[PDB]
Amino acid sequence: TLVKCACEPCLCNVDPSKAIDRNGLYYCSEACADGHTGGSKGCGHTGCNCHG
Ligand SMILES: [Zn+2]
Ligand SMILES: [Zn+2]
Ligand SMILES: [Zn+2]
Ligand SMILES: [Zn+2]
Protein backbone atom coordinates (compact mmCIF):
# COMPACT_ATOMS: atom_id res chain seq x y z
CA THR A 1 0.00 0.00 0.00
CA LEU A 2 1.39 3.51 -0.69
CA VAL A 3 1.41 6.25 1.99
CA LYS A 4 1.02 10.04 1.52
CA CYS A 5 3.98 12.45 1.56
CA ALA A 6 4.49 14.86 4.50
CA CYS A 7 3.37 17.91 2.47
CA GLU A 8 -0.43 18.42 2.78
CA PRO A 9 -0.81 19.75 -0.81
CA CYS A 10 1.59 17.04 -2.15
CA LEU A 11 -0.46 14.62 -4.29
CA CYS A 12 2.47 12.15 -4.42
CA ASN A 13 2.04 8.59 -3.11
CA VAL A 14 5.40 7.32 -1.71
CA ASP A 15 6.51 4.31 0.40
CA PRO A 16 8.40 4.59 3.76
CA SER A 17 10.90 1.89 2.65
CA LYS A 18 12.12 4.00 -0.34
CA ALA A 19 11.31 7.64 0.57
CA ILE A 20 13.64 10.03 2.41
CA ASP A 21 12.10 9.17 5.78
CA ARG A 22 13.77 11.08 8.66
CA ASN A 23 11.94 10.10 11.87
CA GLY A 24 8.61 8.41 11.00
CA LEU A 25 7.85 11.21 8.46
CA TYR A 26 8.11 10.37 4.70
CA TYR A 27 9.41 12.96 2.15
CA CYS A 28 9.06 12.33 -1.60
CA SER A 29 11.94 14.59 -2.80
CA GLU A 30 14.56 16.62 -0.93
CA ALA A 31 12.24 19.57 -1.71
CA CYS A 32 9.47 18.26 0.60
CA ALA A 33 12.17 17.47 3.22
CA ASP A 34 13.60 21.01 3.01
CA GLY A 35 10.02 22.35 2.83
CA HIS A 36 10.39 24.18 -0.51
CA THR A 37 12.50 26.81 1.24
CA GLY A 38 12.52 30.30 -0.31
CA GLY A 39 11.56 29.44 -3.90
CA SER A 40 8.39 28.21 -5.54
CA LYS A 41 7.12 24.76 -6.48
CA GLY A 42 6.89 21.23 -6.00
CA CYS A 43 8.93 18.10 -5.79
CA GLY A 44 10.88 17.54 -9.05
CA HIS A 45 8.23 15.19 -10.58
CA THR A 46 5.25 16.36 -12.63
CA GLY A 47 2.70 19.07 -11.75
CA CYS A 48 2.76 18.74 -7.94
CA ASN A 49 2.45 22.39 -6.72
CA CYS A 50 3.22 21.59 -3.05
CA HIS A 51 4.59 24.36 -0.80
CA GLY A 52 6.17 23.69 2.63
ZN1 LIG B 1 4.77 17.54 -4.02
ZN1 LIG C 1 6.15 15.48 -1.45
ZN1 LIG D 1 6.40 19.32 -0.93
ZN1 LIG E 1 6.44 14.54 -5.00
UniProtKB/Swiss-Prot annotation:
Keyword Oxidoreductase: no
Binding site for Zn(2+) 1: 5, 10, 28, 32
UniProt binding sites for Zn(2+) 4: 12, 28, 43, 45
Residues holding Zn(2+) 2: 7, 32, 36, 50
Regulation: induction: Upon exposure to a range of metals, particularly cadmium, zinc, copper and mercury.
Keyword annotations: Cadmium, Copper, Mercury, Metal-binding, Metal-thiolate cluster, Zinc
UniProt: Zn(2+) 3 binding residues: 10, 43, 48, 50
GO molecular function, one term: metal ion binding
Function comment: May play a role in essential metal ion homeostasis (especially zinc homeostasis) and resistance to certain non-essential metal ions. Binds four zinc ions.
UniProt similarity note: Belongs to the metallothionein superfamily. Type 14 family.
Protein known as: Metallothionein
Natural source organism: Synechococcus elongatus (strain ATCC 33912 / PCC 7942 / FACHB-805) (Anacystis nidulans R2)
Gene name tied to this protein: smtA
